[PDB]
Each structure stands twice: as C-alpha cells, then as structure tokens.
Recover the amino acids of this structure.
C-alpha cells in the first residue's frame, strides 16, 4: 500500500487548512490529454416498441 | 375626400337620437349579394410534427 504513496505525511490533529483561492478569478485549465473522457450511450427510440413517434 | 360623403349634414351639439327598436319582433333580413364574406383557411395537420396521427 505504501508503494502508492503521494503525500509525504499523514494528516495530524491540529493541522490548519489553507485556502488557495482567496479572491474571485477567471480560471486557466490545463491537463494531459488522456485525463478527461466523454462516455456516450445510444438511446434506442428506433425500436419497434415506439410506434407513435417519428 | 368629399366624393365619399354619404350624409348632407354633420352632427349638431344637442340633437335627439331615435332608437328604432320598440318591440321584440323577429327580423326579416335583406342585402345585395356579396355583402357577407365568409373567410376560410386550412388547418395543417399533415406536417411531420404531428406524425403520431392519421
């Protein structure tokens, strides 16, 4: 399990939480291409079961 | 404009109007033909948005 470590230390008891967005700002987004996907499934309204609608 | 004048005299200030219905008698109507226009227009139900019906 320790082979998957990312942070160097565990959360302590009294640790203060910093807030990185202090002020309103317009974002700039960057990623490696692989990170985001779009999953899409078809909706079968062409099936025999729907005979009313075109 | 005077070509359209159908009356010899404009309305005075104090002038007696005369209502001609003193009784409930049932009408007898006469007109010169083409005095009543009947306007018609189709209802377009054949459109593809209506496809769920004949």
């Amino acid at each position: 399990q320790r082979a998957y470590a990312n942070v160097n230390t565990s959360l302590a008891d009294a640790m203060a939480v910093n807030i990185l967005n202090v002020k309103d700002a317009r974002t700039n987004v960057f990623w490696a291409d692989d990170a985001i996907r779009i999953v899409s499934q078809p909706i079968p309204a062409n099936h025999e079961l729907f005979a009313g609608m075109k």
Notes: Chain A is about 0% helix and 0% strand. The interface with chain B takes residues 52-54 of chain A (CB under 8 Å). Residues 29 and 36 of chain A are 12 Å apart (CA to CA). The radius of gyration of chain A is 24 Å.
